[PDB]
Design a protein around this ligand. Structure first.
Ligand code: BGC
Ligand code: CA
Length: 309
C-alpha cells in the first residue's frame, strides 16, 4: 500500500534544486503506491530540523534530505536513527564519517572536483582561441570568482579546481576579486556591480562563477556597465543558461545532471522504503553508499546536444 516518503529541499527558489525538485515529483507520478511529502526548508536548518520531526511523526518509510547545512547530517541521522528510517542525502554532501555512522544513510550527488576541472578546461580552451581576452597582454588570466556557499562541497571543489586545472595546463592566473554570492543571482549581480564600480574594474578579463545562477547575475551586471565583451563561465547548464550560451552571453557551463540525480534519489528512497536494498532493480552504481552522476562540459561547440531536442 501507500508508502510515505518525506523530502526536504533546502530552499525551493534555488534554481538548480527547483529542477531537481520537479524531476523527483515527476518520477513519483509513476509510482502509484508512493505518497511524497515535500517540504521547503526555506534555507534554515532549524526549520528543516522541525520538518523532519513532523515527517517522522507522520510515519514516513524513508527520508530524502537536501540539507541546508551539510554539517547538520549528524543531527538528521540521530533523528532518523530513532525510528530506524533510511535517509538518502542528496546534493549537499555530508562528511564520510557522518555517512559511516548509520547503516541506512546514503548520498546521491556528484564528484564535485570534476566540475571544477571541466570548467578549467573550458576556460583554457576558450582563452587559447581568444587571445583578445588577455587585455593587458601579460599572458595571465586576471579573473574574479563568484563562490557558492562557504563549506559547501561543490563551492569548495569548484573554486579550488578551476584554478588548479588552468595552472596545471600551464596558464598563470591572477585573482583580482573572490567573494561568495551564496549561489544566488541577485547577490552575484550586486557583487559584480561593486567590482565593476571599483579600482580593478578595468583589469578584469574573465568571470568565473561556481554556478549558472551566479553567472547570470554577473551577465546582468556586465550588461549594465556595457562590459558584455567580458566572458563568463558557470556550472549547471540550466535551460536559462543554455540560451545565454547560444547567445554568446555565457562562454561555457557544465551540465549538473538534475534528471539522473533526481531519478537515483527517488529509486534509492523507494527501494529503501520498501525494505529492498538500495539499487535493487536499477542500474545505479553504489560505491560505499554513494551514487555520483557525471558532469559534462557544455559550450557552443557541443550545445546542439543539450539544447532543445
Ligand atoms: O546545493 C545547491 C547548489 O548545488 C550545486 O550543485 C549547484 O550547482 C548549485 O546551482 C546549487 O545552488
Ligand atoms: Ca592578462
Amino acid at each position: 500500500a501507500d508508502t510515505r516518503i518525506g523530502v526536504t529541499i533546502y530552499k525551493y527558489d534555488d534554481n538548480f534544486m527547483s529542477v531537481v525538485r520537479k524531476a523527483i515529483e515527476q518520477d513519483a507520478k509513476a509510482a502509484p503506491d508512493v505518497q511524497l511529502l515535500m517540504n521547503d526548508s526555506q534555507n534554515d536548518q532549524s526549520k528543516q530540523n522541525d520538518q523532519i520531526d513532523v515527517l517522522l511523526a507522520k510515519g514516513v518509510k524513508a527520508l530524502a534530505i537536501n540539507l541546508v547545512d551539510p554539517a547538520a547530517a549528524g543531527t538528521v541521522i540521530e533523528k532518523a536513527r530513532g525510528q530506524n528510517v533510511p535517509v538518502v542525502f542528496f546534493n549537499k554532501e555530508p562528511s564520510r564519517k557522518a555517512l559511516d555512522s548509520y547503516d541506512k544513510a546514503y548520498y546521491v550527488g556528484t564528484d564535485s572536483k570534476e566540475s571544477g576541472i571541466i570548467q578549467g578546461d573550458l576556460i583554457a580552451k576558450h582563452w587559447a582561441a581568444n587571445q583578445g581576452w588577455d587585455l593587458n597582454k601579460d599572458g595571465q588570466i586576471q579573473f574574479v570568482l563568484l563562490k557558492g556557499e562557504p563549506g559547501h562541497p561543490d563551492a569548495e571543489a569548484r573554486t579550488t579546481y578551476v584554478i588548479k586545472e588552468l595552472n596545471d595546463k600551464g596558464i598563470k592566473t591572477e585573482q583580482l576579486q573572490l567573494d561568495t554570492a551564496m549561489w544566488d543571482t541577485a547577490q552575484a549581480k550586486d557583487k559584480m556591480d561593486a567590482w565593476l564600480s571599483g579600482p580593478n574594474a578595468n583589469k578584469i578579463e574573465v568571470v568565473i562563477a561556481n554556478n549558472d545562477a551566479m553567472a547570470m547575475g554577473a551577465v546582468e551586471a556586465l550588461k549594465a556597465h556595457n562590459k558584455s565583451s567580458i566572458p563568463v563561465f558557470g556550472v549547471d547548464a540550466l535551460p536559462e543558461a543554455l540560451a545565454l550560451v547560444k547567445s554568446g552571453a555565457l562562454a561555457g557551463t557544465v551540465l549538473n545532471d538534475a534528471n539522473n540525480q533526481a531519478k537515483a534519489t527517488f529509486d534509492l528512497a523507494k527501494n529503501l522504503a520498501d525494505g529492498k536494498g538500495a539499487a535493487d532493480g536499477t542500474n545505479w552504481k553504489i560505491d560505499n553508499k554513494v551514487v555520483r552522476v557525471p558532469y559534462v562540459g557544455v559550450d557552443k561547440d557541443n550545445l546542439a546536444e543539450f539544447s532543445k531536442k
